Write a protein that binds this ligand. Sequence first.
Ligand SMILES: CC(C)C[C@@H]1NC(=O)c2c1c1c3ccccc3n(CCCCN)c1c1[nH]c3ccccc3c21
Length: 267
Amino acid sequence: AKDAWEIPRESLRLEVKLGQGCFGEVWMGTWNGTTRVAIKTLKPGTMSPEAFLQEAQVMKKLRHEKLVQLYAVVSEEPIYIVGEYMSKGSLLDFLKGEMGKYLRLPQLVDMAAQIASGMAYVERMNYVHRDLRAANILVGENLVCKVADFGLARLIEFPIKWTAPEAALYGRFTIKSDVWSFGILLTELTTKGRVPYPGMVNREVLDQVERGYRMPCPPECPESLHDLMCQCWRKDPEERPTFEYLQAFLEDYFTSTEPQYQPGENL
Ligand SMILES: CC(C)C[C@@H]1NC(=O)c2c1c1c3ccccc3n(CCCCN)c1c1[nH]c3ccccc3c21
């Protein structure tokens, strides 16, 4: 047979390495000498397809403005994956970078809104991400944010700190378990890249969380946004808000929730 996304190898041209990985690397290049693309290569032979194209198989059935776009694939060795190019790289690196110092609440909340918007689409498609966090979020020009990295992210039929209890203990990955991760993601944005649960390892946090402990309101962060985190951190996953609620709440934040927001030294 043949693949509808399959393009010839001579259609692209790798130029600049964007960052090596433990399963390959990412390259900026030109598709047909006109299309600016981002090629995800392969480093043999750890993976070594399981299939490695499963990253793309899901990116075929999904399409949204807040999701990183799939362009094409290459089935023969060396295996390649062509897709949308995000100039600023990972959100985590971006927050930890120089720009993180100048980011304030308006920009941070707006970025979360886009992610919530992207995840709202995923919610409508009846899909789960299973690894929603700042490291898996690509940022481009004009502070645009797009959901990325779809490993084993499938239908409905170890980042423990970002993972919901029922998903870590019983493997019950739902769209409501992604909401949990979104609440953790909101702490990463309000701390500008700090690892959640500071001074706390995987075993002690899982026990502490199961007992009912939740992360405190981060410095300069308003109570209204912290409450949203707690809603996402409710023990019973059915009570967690939808991404439809999350997107709408964030988009209308500085008008309907905090109309009297005054900038601080960090937020
Ligand atoms: C559409 C796809 C093939 C390429 C995507 N486009 C980029 O510009 C880009 C991309 C990825 C990506 C995709 C899938 C899995 C991991 C990926 N990574 C590693 C980051 C850790 C993810 N949790 C990427 C990355 N890293 C950067 C650094 C600087 C500039 C651009 C990218 C950059």
